[PDB]
Amino acid sequence: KVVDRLDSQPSAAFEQTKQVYTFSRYILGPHRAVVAPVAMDPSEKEVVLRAVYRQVFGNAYIMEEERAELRVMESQFLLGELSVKELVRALAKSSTYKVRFFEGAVQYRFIELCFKHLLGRAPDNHEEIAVHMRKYQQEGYDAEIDSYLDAGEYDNVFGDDTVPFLRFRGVYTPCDSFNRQCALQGGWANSDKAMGGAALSGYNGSDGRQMSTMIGNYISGKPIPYEKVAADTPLKSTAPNWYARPNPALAPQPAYVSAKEIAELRSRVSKLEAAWSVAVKQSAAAKDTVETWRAAAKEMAAMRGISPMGEAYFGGIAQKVDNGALAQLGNKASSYKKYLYAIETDEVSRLEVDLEEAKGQLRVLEAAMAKSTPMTRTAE
Amino acid sequence: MQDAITSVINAADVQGKYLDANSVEKLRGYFQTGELRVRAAATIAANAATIIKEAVAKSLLYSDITRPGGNMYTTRRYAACIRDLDYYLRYATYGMLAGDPSILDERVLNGLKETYNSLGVPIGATIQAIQAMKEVTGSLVGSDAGKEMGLYFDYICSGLS
Amino acid sequence: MKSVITTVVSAADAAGRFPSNSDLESIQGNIQRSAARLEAAEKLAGNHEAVVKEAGDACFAKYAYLKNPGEAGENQEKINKCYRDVDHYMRLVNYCLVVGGTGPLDEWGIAGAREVYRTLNLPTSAYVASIAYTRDRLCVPRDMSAQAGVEFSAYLDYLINALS
Amino acid sequence: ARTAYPYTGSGYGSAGVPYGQDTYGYKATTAKSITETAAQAGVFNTFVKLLNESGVEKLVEQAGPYTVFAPTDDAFAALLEPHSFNKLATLLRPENNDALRKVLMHHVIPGAFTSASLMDRAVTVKSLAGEPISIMGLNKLVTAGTAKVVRADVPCANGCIIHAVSSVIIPPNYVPVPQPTKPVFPRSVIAEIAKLPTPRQALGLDP
Amino acid sequence: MLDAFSRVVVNSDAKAAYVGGSDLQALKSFIADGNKRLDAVNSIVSNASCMVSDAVSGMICENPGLISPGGNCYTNRRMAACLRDGEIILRYVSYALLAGDASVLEDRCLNGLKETYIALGVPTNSSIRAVSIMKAQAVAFITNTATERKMSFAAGDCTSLASEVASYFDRVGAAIS
Amino acid sequence: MLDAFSRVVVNSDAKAAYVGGSDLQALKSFIADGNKRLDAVNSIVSNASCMVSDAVSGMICENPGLISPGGNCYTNRRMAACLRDGEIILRYVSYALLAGDASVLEDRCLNGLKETYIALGVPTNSSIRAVSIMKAQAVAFITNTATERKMSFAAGDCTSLASEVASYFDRVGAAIS
Amino acid sequence: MLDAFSRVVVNSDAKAAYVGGSDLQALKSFIADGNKRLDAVNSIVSNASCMVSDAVSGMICENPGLISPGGNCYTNRRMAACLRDGEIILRYVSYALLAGDASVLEDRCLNGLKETYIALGVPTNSSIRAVSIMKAQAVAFITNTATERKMSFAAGDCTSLASEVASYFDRVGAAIS
Amino acid sequence: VTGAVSSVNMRRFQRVPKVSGFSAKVTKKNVNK
Ligand SMILES: C=CC1=C(C)[C@@H](Cc2[nH]c(/C=C3N=C(/C=C4\NC(=O)[C@H](C)[C@H]4CC)C(C)=C\3CCC(=O)O)c(CCC(=O)O)c2C)NC1=O
Ligand SMILES: C=CC1=C(C)[C@@H](Cc2[nH]c(/C=C3N=C(/C=C4\NC(=O)[C@H](C)[C@H]4CC)C(C)=C\3CCC(=O)O)c(CCC(=O)O)c2C)NC1=O
Ligand SMILES: C=CC1=C(C)[C@@H](Cc2[nH]c(/C=C3N=C(/C=C4\NC(=O)[C@H](C)[C@H]4CC)C(C)=C\3CCC(=O)O)c(CCC(=O)O)c2C)NC1=O
Ligand SMILES: C=CC1=C(C)[C@@H](Cc2[nH]c(/C=C3N=C(/C=C4\NC(=O)[C@H](C)[C@H]4CC)C(C)=C\3CCC(=O)O)c(CCC(=O)O)c2C)NC1=O
Ligand SMILES: C=CC1=C(C)[C@@H](Cc2[nH]c(/C=C3N=C(/C=C4\NC(=O)[C@H](C)[C@H]4CC)C(C)=C\3CCC(=O)O)c(CCC(=O)O)c2C)NC1=O
Ligand SMILES: C=CC1=C(C)[C@@H](Cc2[nH]c(/C=C3N=C(/C=C4\NC(=O)[C@H](C)[C@H]4CC)C(C)=C\3CCC(=O)O)c(CCC(=O)O)c2C)NC1=O
Ligand SMILES: C=CC1=C(C)[C@@H](Cc2[nH]c(/C=C3N=C(/C=C4\NC(=O)[C@H](C)[C@H]4CC)C(C)=C\3CCC(=O)O)c(CCC(=O)O)c2C)NC1=O
Ligand SMILES: C=CC1=C(C)[C@@H](Cc2[nH]c(/C=C3N=C(/C=C4\NC(=O)[C@H](C)[C@H]4CC)C(C)=C\3CCC(=O)O)c(CCC(=O)O)c2C)NC1=O
Ligand SMILES: C=CC1=C(C)[C@@H](Cc2[nH]c(/C=C3N=C(/C=C4\NC(=O)[C@H](C)[C@H]4CC)C(C)=C\3CCC(=O)O)c(CCC(=O)O)c2C)NC1=O
Ligand SMILES: C=CC1=C(C)[C@@H](Cc2[nH]c(/C=C3N=C(/C=C4\NC(=O)[C@H](C)[C@H]4CC)C(C)=C\3CCC(=O)O)c(CCC(=O)O)c2C)NC1=O
Ligand SMILES: C=CC1=C(C)[C@@H](Cc2[nH]c(/C=C3N=C(/C=C4\NC(=O)[C@H](C)[C@H]4CC)C(C)=C\3CCC(=O)O)c(CCC(=O)O)c2C)NC1=O
Ligand SMILES: C=CC1=C(C)[C@@H](Cc2[nH]c(/C=C3N=C(/C=C4\NC(=O)[C@H](C)[C@H]4CC)C(C)=C\3CCC(=O)O)c(CCC(=O)O)c2C)NC1=O
Ligand SMILES: CCC1=C(C)/C(=C/C2=NC(=C\c3[nH]c(/C=C4\NC(=O)[C@H](C)[C@H]4CC)c(C)c3CCC(=O)O)/C(CCC(=O)O)=C2C)NC1=O
């Protein structure tokens, strides 16, 4: 049992943050919990408000002409009457949220947008999308928003005072939901006006169709392609910035690719997996030369064992050392350091590195091999 | 090969110029560090065998490359690789004394990757052994000389990769 | 990595502000304290093959029961992997002396340690015994200078407090 | 058999692989030179034509290890936008070869930088034009100034690599050559004497 | 995100090497001209308000088609977003120059910016020109060679920081391309 | 673009100097009236972005079925890609004007474009309407009879030059047909 | 979304033209029979509850395979969703007829509907038939030619609004196809 | 028989007080009563 409770459950009284958040991608990037303290400077109220406008509108410019709408409902929060959840309820039912995210949108786009705004998550399966569609169609937009906020999942996670944030749970039931979450927030330099296409389709950028991709992925269980999860993503806005043995970030696809290099690379990977699957069986059986003699040499070494200092004079000369857990058995500082070069020294591990990087080079070439007719070629 | 002095003189001569204030700046810079360079070169000449022994012990001595199937399994291959490491250390010392890595380009790196690829010598393990040698060498010669030697060690590793 | 630099420019990025005078003023202390905190870095880096040796046997001298069969250090390769962990932790302390914050410790030794040490039956008290043995054996004019010793001990006890 | 990585050699201590994978210790050179490889690649036609008529062909034909960042024909066709056009239009005039030479020479780097050499590294060097150029590939995205390499590494004869880039790199210290114009002379000798202040005006004694 | 100090730490962690005396030559030289780095960042953030309106108006007085009807900078809303864009890029470049490492630039500003403009229909030619004019202003303000503002400095050379910020700006330009 | 004009002058070429050079053909085109061709291609590259925008909006405000769902200009990708295609065609015809020759206009864009648009299901007549709109905008910019836009030129007639791009745009419109 | 008045405004904004007296003959005629437009919308929204159960039951007696086991309208849940979809399409068509412009129809209802019905496995043949029966009911209710329940109107001609709503319904049908 | 979940006000009396939030303010007024 390495994970005790999830984050959908309310937080325990023993932990300051949830246990899932301590070793997920939560500790890395700016997708963290911003709690409003109980008495606030007018300085530090704006720290909360900027995070709210960053989250609820989901990366929007918002000129101060478009802020004089919301100067009434921010004032009830600045006084200290509105909580943070009632502030996002008042902001979702305002008109600037409507004209941006409801008033040119297909219903799938609006539902998947307020899943990302009011909660930190993607649409999970189809059955939870349909219940919100039927919630809107009989009761309206106003009760549709309260269907998101006033249920179990908001108050156990955010409470009433953390601003919503993109949740890096670590425990995903439907799996793909992680890929949908990473493809819904498109990294730090994206927005929903751009990803929804509401500006190119719009007239002078206003009155845009808020269209949506990935609605074939909601209905049929057909999961998100890897390029929208690895290229533009919060995975690389909240990256660990370390040395990975396979680098997971995709290279940009090369112009002027040929089929000959793809054929030789596809032969290389097929040689490498066949070499790996036979190098596996020999490992942990014939891995060592001094392994049969490990049981033999122990009884020769067991003689002349002494406690105090100075023994093994070996004739007239006095000096001796021994007495050390690692040293009693002949090991040095280099004996534990052999595990730190295994990437480039273990015969099995070399194949596993070069298998993964030949795969990563392979995967980008057929993305470049999707374009045929007016496509000029070279000779390498 | 050209050292720092030769490089400055060449840069000045290739323009028909006399050695002006910037050349004097570089020349003074080399002349101030020359004595530290001589000290480091002497100390490295003193302890070459122990440096190579310790680098090999910390980098690839107990890995799988020394076991059957590994590059340097047999005694021929072990001796050949320790000779290679001796080459790298000696030429890095030459480059540190000269203050210029052109000797490494002319006498070491020219056609080395191709030879290793034809022989089947693993490049990553070699770079790793050179990095371990950089640790021991900087350790033995102190911070400034270690920084100087590590410059040319990293030059060799970049030319090999 | 949490350092003096990455703290003040993420506080500025979260507010959308240019680097103000407080942001420049915070890095001025990174000029003064880096004479002391870097002096311990090469001192630990050059003599790191005597500190791991002296901590590893002190761990097993406090807890001799670990060499019993069924325990964590029953055979030789487990003790070999045990000395490797103290080498890893001293390498992370060497890194944290160089960045100037607890960045590399919190990323590479602290986060997720409390799950793997409970899953693989590694006793955390035997982990903090070696770090405490390194902590009380700091001769403040002999190992390093005074402030370098303060900066070294403040990173050792941070790991001690985080592991327990 | 084993060691997925077999070795070369013969006699006792062998494995079954000839010395050098074909018994060739020191292999002949199969790659062509820079302008040769470019001219057969079929995509660097404008680059090779400019190198030939500009006189920079002599520089890149030397044995010295170079890293060339040749822009594809797409890159030269993409100069027809307004901004880059305003900076490089006067390079079409037949008397402006001296600046075309520096623009072309800015693309040649001394030393052989492979793409794997530059992963997660930021390097500053001087190109043959004498100008600093920064080459940094972070997260498998290589850049040379504002180049954005598109085809990684084409090996050439004397350890010189070719990187295909999608735009032209303007040198930093580049002022565009101005358009030719009529030479103007002053019409009035008295109109210019009226332009110069006299001593009593520098004193403040006069208007 | 990383800085100049942690950059060598992830390089040493890739080989389990301690940071030795070879590695600290590059970092103790980072401390010696740290005051020049603070003096260089202070000159940029002082005139950062003029730099955006300088660069965007230069981009206009070159491609009038942006203020043409239907153009990408035609509306007051679109002109405000372009002026807002410029300032964000100038902010992250000044973060990267202060940190001494380009890491915070290309996971918080440039990661996903290529598709952001492509999907918006933002023309990339003028995006290159708005960044290059800001780069030209940066080298003038660091080397104290602006036409009509000179700032007080201690005497010495500063072309290394100027070349560093010039190296950050074409990283931005190659990212948006 | 860059290699359109010969620029023979070279020093110590060792291939060019003391060797035969395109003196007979390259020089005559340049002498004969290249300033008019240069004002021409400048009047295209300073107006290009407004030209493709006004062209695609004229096509859309003639035929709304592409912006309807099921249309080829619906979706985020189509609007972005169609703008890109029209601008590419503009850049190639601007080069073909600058060269005084339509060979690369065949070889790099018009070679096999119609079969590509058939394989993608792109409607042809809308793109023909688009390139005719670009042809009208080009000859309007070349007669300096833009009702909205003004540049100062040295005085004279550019009628011969204007036909050139009409022949080129008709080559495009016939090759797509 | 747009209406009939703003439709000519985006047409004039594409050329920076003021809306002159030529443009207002189409809009002052939109005001003259505005009462007929309100009287036409009121006749549809009055019998909108009968129209869905009229059309969906007609689509069933077309094809008994929908209520067949495994069929798309086999479950009570699926029949309720089909009656729900019918009403949404009738709601957006009555929005578009009230606005005098089809803009709110094909970015809030039809944008993304075809691949939704493809992904769900909804058969498109019966989807066409459920819309065409509602179209036939719309022309009967606007022209007051319904078998049952006639409605009181002022005398005059209304085939223009009937042709407009017939033009909206095959837009819906071509979108779901 | 319909399916009626417990309302949110029926569930807000089971909450746990958190002093770091604004929810301290409702356990102000719950206590002087
Ligand atoms: C609902 C279903 C569900 C799962 C199956 C898991 C699987 C899972 N693991 C990781 C994330 C990870 N998963 C692994 C696991 C492994 N790497 C290896 O080399 C081994 C083969 C293997 C362990 C045996 C590692 C090492 C990471 C961390 C990657 C990183 O931190 O960069 C992530 C991304 C989120 C994160 O970063 O934590 C997910 C979804 N989690 C879930 O919610
Ligand atoms: C990198 C930092 C650094 C340190 C922290 C010390 C650490 C250190 N010193 C000693 C070794 C020693 N350390 C001391 C120091 C002391 N003994 C005492 O009783 C006093 C408390 C204290 C001085 C005030 C002495 C006297 C020895 C030699 C004998 C002994 O082990 O006690 C050892 C055992 C292995 C060896 O002999 O080297 C270690 C790890 N040295 C370093 O290079
Ligand atoms: C980067 C940071 C880093 C670490 C801190 C260690 C932490 C660590 N230790 C072990 C694994 C182990 N760690 C120990 C260590 C010890 N057991 C004890 O009783 C003592 C407390 C201690 C020695 C002093 C042992 C004995 C094992 C083997 C346990 C097993 O194989 O199940 C493992 C499992 C994989 C492995 O075998 O390496 C990991 C991740 N590794 C790392 O990569
Ligand atoms: C975190 C990083 C980050 C950025 C870099 C910016 C960049 C950025 N700009 C825009 C949005 C925009 N960006 C521009 C900018 C330009 N158009 C041009 O023709 C010029 C070349 C350039 C100005 C110099 C314009 C005009 C819009 C508005 C498009 C519209 O309203 O339709 C958007 C979409 C959101 C929106 O609609 O406002 C984003 C993400 N914002 C960020 O959050
Ligand atoms: C066609 C339209 C057009 C413009 C709008 C201007 C804008 C402009 N200025 C500069 C060039 C510059 N622009 C600035 C910016 C400023 N200068 C200051 O003194 C202030 C602090 C700040 C704005 C208030 C600076 C500092 C330089 C460098 C040279 C200098 O001014 O000393 C450049 C790049 C190089 C150049 O072309 O000169 C451009 C395009 N120039 C143009 O050609
Ligand atoms: C908290 C805010 C804060 C700052 C703004 C800087 C302020 C600052 N700059 C310099 C000092 C300096 N700054 C420069 C820089 C330059 N000189 C030139 O002629 C070039 C135009 C420009 C290059 C970019 C130089 C050359 C020195 C002196 C050398 C040095 O001190 O490193 C110094 C040391 C001299 C002194 O003032 O005592 C200080 C404190 N430091 C801080 O702590
Ligand atoms: C209902 C949709 C609709 C539109 C979007 C416009 C689109 C449009 N513009 C022009 C016509 C033109 N378009 C331009 C282009 C420009 N003018 C400038 O000054 C700018 C620099 C540049 C971008 C705005 C020019 C110069 C002409 C010719 C002069 C003119 O007719 O205005 C033409 C006529 C071309 C022809 O067939 O002969 C059309 C259809 N008109 C429409 O009916
Ligand atoms: C060297 C010259 C050169 C070109 C001209 C383009 C030509 C071109 N366009 C497209 C691709 C396309 N081209 C269009 C363009 C249009 N569709 C319309 O209805 C309008 C008539 C027109 C815009 C005005 C669209 C919409 C696509 C994408 C079709 C799709 O989504 O599959 C493709 C397929 C690759 C891709 O999808 O991106 C190619 C080769 N590419 C080149 O390399
Ligand atoms: C590198 C950039 C570059 C250019 C943009 C042109 C700019 C240019 N044009 C002309 C000169 C001219 N340019 C034109 C062209 C025209 N006049 C009109 O009224 C028509 C609108 C248009 C026809 C297309 C004419 C007619 C002359 C004068 C005769 C001639 O020199 O061709 C001249 C010589 C006299 C002068 O200085 O004005 C120059 C330098 N030349 C260059 O070197
Ligand atoms: C905003 C615009 C908007 C719409 C147009 C509708 C259309 C629509 N219908 C369904 C969902 C459905 N739609 C139908 C409808 C039909 N199947 C048939 O055979 C007939 C041809 C037709 C009825 C006349 C059925 C039967 C389902 C249920 C499929 C299922 O439950 O598996 C769904 C998926 C969500 C869900 O499962 O309920 C959507 C988006 N809803 C909207 O929100
Ligand atoms: C095979 C199965 C089958 C059915 C279930 C019915 C359904 C039905 N009715 C109409 C045709 C129509 N359907 C209606 C709808 C209504 N009429 C009213 O008077 C009410 C207000 C409302 C339902 C309560 C109207 C108004 C017409 C036009 C003619 C008329 O009724 O006056 C049509 C299209 C033309 C036609 O076929 O007649 C169909 C399929 N007819 C069938 O063939
Ligand atoms: C978890 C436990 C739980 C409950 C016990 C119920 C009880 C309950 N009822 C109401 C709300 C109400 N409750 C009643 C009920 C009655 N009025 C009468 O005169 C009768 C005595 C009695 C019915 C038999 C009425 C009439 C309202 C509506 C008041 C209004 O609309 O103004 C409310 C406030 C929320 C709302 O407005 O709907 C709550 C919490 N709901 C719950 O969630
Ligand atoms: C002056 C510059 C220079 C260098 C460096 C050089 C290297 C060189 N290394 C060789 C072999 C070798 N080199 C190695 C080295 C290694 N094996 C490993 O696993 C390690 C990673 C690595 C040591 C660090 C081995 C094992 C061979 C023998 C190959 C064989 O016998 O098949 C040979 C073949 C000659 C022979 O031994 O007969 C040459 C010429 N020549 C030069 O002129």
CATH of the domain at C152: 1.10.490.20
Angstrom distance (rounded) from CA A195 to CA F77: 11
List residues forming the annotated binding site of E for phycourobilin.
Answer: 50, 61
Q: Name all chains with 3 or more CB-CB pairs below 8 Å to chain G.
A: A, E, F
Q: How far is CA G177 from CA A261, C131, E148, in A?
A: 42, 72, 65
Report yes or no: B146 at the E interface, CB cutoff 8 Å: yes
- A368: helix, strand or coil: helix
Residue B91: other Cβ atoms inside 10 A = 18
Round to the nearest angstrom and report the end-to-end CA distance of chain H: 39
Residue E137, SS3? helix
8 A C-beta contact, residue C36 and residue C147:
yes
Q: For chain E, what is the largest distance between any 2 Cα atoms, rounded to a whole number of angstroms?
A: 62
Backbone phi and psi for residue D200, each to the nearest 5 degrees, phi listed first: -65, -20
Decide whether any atom of ligand 7 lies within 6 Å of the G61 Cβ.
no
Task: Show which of residues 211-240 on chain A sit within 8 Å of chain F, judged by CB atoms.
Answer: 211, 213
* H24 contacts A80? CB cut-off 8 A: no
Are F162 and F40 within 8 A, CB to CB? no
**Closest-CA distance of chain D to residue A217, Å:** 29
Q: Using CB atoms, pick whichever of C52, C57, C59 lies closest to residue A333.
A: C52
Domain count for chain E, please give it. Answer: 1
Sheet holding D141-144, edge to edge: D121-126, D132-138, D141-144
CA of C81 to the centre of ligand 3 (A): 6
Q: Are E20 and B138 contacting, i.e. CB atoms less than 8 angstroms apart?
A: yes
Cα-to-chain-centroid distance, residue A290: 44
C-alpha atoms less than 13 angstroms from C-alpha of A298 in its C-beta half-sphere = 8
Q: Rounded distance, CA G86 to CA G131, Å?
A: 8
The experimental method is cryo-EM
Which atom belonging to ligand 12 lies closest to the Cα atom of H5? 43
Closest by Cβ to A282, choosing from D2, D43, D119:
D2
Which pairs count as long-range contacts for G43-47, CB under 8 Å and 24+ apart, including other chains?
G43/G141, G43/G142, G43/G144, G43/G151, G44/G90, G44/G94, G44/G97, G44/G138, G44/G141, G44/G142, G44/G165, G45/G94, G46/G151, G47/G137, G47/G141, G47/G146, G47/G149
Report the pocket of ligand 2 as residue ranges, CB < 6 Å.
Answer: C 43-44, 47, 50-51, 54, 137-139, 142-143
DSSP state letters, chain F: -TTSS-----SS-SSSTTS--S-TTHHHHHHTTHHHHHHHHHHHHTTHHHHHHHHHHHHHTT-GGGTSTTSSS-SHHHHHHHHHHHHHHHHHHHHHHHHT--HHIIIIIITT-HHHHHHTT--HHHHHHHHHHHHHHHHHHHTT--SS------SS--HHHHHHHHHHHHHHHHH--
Binding-site residues of F for phycourobilin sit at 50, 61
D149: helix, coil or strand?
strand
Q: Which of E133, E134, E135 to mutate to test the pocket of ligand 5 (most atoms within 8 A of CB)?
A: E133
Cβ atoms F113, F175 nearer than 8 A: yes
Ligand 4 centroid from CA G11, angstroms: 25
Give the residue on G whose Cα is nearest the Cα of A208: G1
Chain B CB within 8 Å of residue D96 CB: no
Which subunits count as partners of chain D given 3+ CB pairs below 8 Å?
Answer: A, B, E, F
Q: Of A205, A232, A341, which has the smallest distance from its Cβ to E115's Cβ? A: A232
Contact B131 E15 (CB under 8 A): yes
**H or E segment and range at residue D150:** strand D149-155
Chains H and C touch, contact meaning at least 3 pairs of CB atoms under 8 angstroms apart: no
Of B131, B142, B148, the CB nearest to E17: B131
Q: How many CB pairs under 8 A join E and F?
A: 37
Supply the residue whose CA is at minimum distance from atom 37 of ligand 13: B80
Amino acid at A245: R
> Given CB atoms, is A255 within the 8 Å cutoff of chain D?
yes
Q: What is the DSSP string of A223-263?
A: PPPTHHHHTSSSTTTS------SS--SPPPPPSS--HHHHH
Closest CA to D150 of A257, B30, F32: A257
Please indicate if any CB of chain A lies within 8 Å of the CB of C46. no
Contacts by residues C110-114 (CB-CB < 8 Å, ≥ 24 positions apart)? C110/C159, C110/C162, C110/C163, C111/A22, C111/A23, C111/A27, C112/A22, C112/A23, C113/C163
- In DSSP notation, D73-142 reads HHHHHGGGSHHHHHHHGGGGSTT-HHHHHHHHHTTEEES---TGGGBTEEEEEE-TTS-EEEEEEETTEE
d(CA A62, CA A70): 11
- Amino acid in position B135: E
> C-alpha distances in angstroms, D76 versus D45, D47, D169?
10, 8, 11
Q: Count the neighbouring beta carbons within 10 Å of the beta carbon of residue G171.
A: 20
Q: Which residue of E has its CA nearest to D126?
A: E163
Give the structural domain span for E169.
1-177
Resolution (A): 3.0
The closest alpha carbon to A220, from A348, A126, A82, belongs to A126
Of G74, G75, G90, G72, which Cα lies nearest the Cα of G130? G90
Q: What angle do CA E175, F2, F8 make, to 5 degrees?
A: 145
Q: From ligand 8's centre to the CA of B1, what distance in Å?
A: 56
Pocket of ligand 9 (CB under 6 A): D 89-90, 93, 179-181; F 33, 35-36, 38-40, 42, 142, 144, 153-156, 158, 161
Q: How far is the CA of A229 from the centre of ligand 10 (A)?
A: 29
Which secondary-structure segment (H or E) carries E38? Answer: helix E34-46
Rounded distance between C-alpha atoms, residue B65 and residue B61, angstroms: 8
Q: State whether E24 and B131 contact (CB < 8 Å).
A: no
Contacts of E68 in chain F (CB under 8 A): 49-50, 53-54, 148
Q: What is the CATH number of the domain that holds F77?
A: 1.10.490.20
Q: Which tokens is A109 given? A: 């786009």
Give chain F positions within 8 Å (CB) of G111: 69, 74
CA of C120 to the centre of ligand 1 (A): 18
First to last CA, chain B: 22
Return d(Cα B74, Cα B65) in angstroms, integer.
Answer: 11
B78 CA to chain D: closest CA distance, Å?
13
Going by C-alpha positions, the residue among E75, E85, E88 that lies closest to residue A202 is: E75
| Cβ contact A341–B67 (<8 Å) | no
Spacing, Cα E40 to ligand 6 middle (Å)? 8
| Residue A216 backbone dihedrals phi, psi, to 5 degrees | -75, -20
Residues of E with CB under 8 A from a CB of G: 69-70
Interior/surface letters E99-135, b for 16+ CB within 10 angstroms, e for the rest: bbbbbbbbbbbbbbbbbbbbbbbbbebbbbbbbbbbb
Of F53, F80, F149, the CB nearest to E70: F53
Find all residues with CB under 8 Å of G175, minimum gap 6, and list them. Answer: F68, F69, F70, G106, G110, G113, G114
